[PDB]
């Protein structure tokens, strides 16, 4: 994946550097950033 930084939130609550890494990690895109807020 390109090591650029355009962060995306995964349905597992984890924040990936970009869409490609989210995909590689086999994680569903979260519905919203609320999923990665921490509370």
Residue extents of the structural domains in the chain = 1-39
Question: How many Cα atoms occupy the beta-carbon half-sphere of 10 within 13 Å?
Answer: 17
Measured distance CA(5)–CA(39) in Å, rounded? 24
CATH code for the domain defined by 1-39: 3.30.60.30
| Strands (E) located in 1-39 | 8-9, 15-16
Could you tell me which residues come within 8 angstroms of residue 22 by beta carbon, excluding any fewer than 6 positions away?
8, 10, 16, 29
């Amino acid at each position: 994946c390109p090591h650029t930084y355009k962060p995306v939130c995964g349905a597992n609550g984890e924040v990936y550097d970009n869409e490609c890494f989210l995909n590689k990690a086999g994680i569903e895109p979260a519905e919203s950033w609320e999923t990665c807020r921490g509370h």
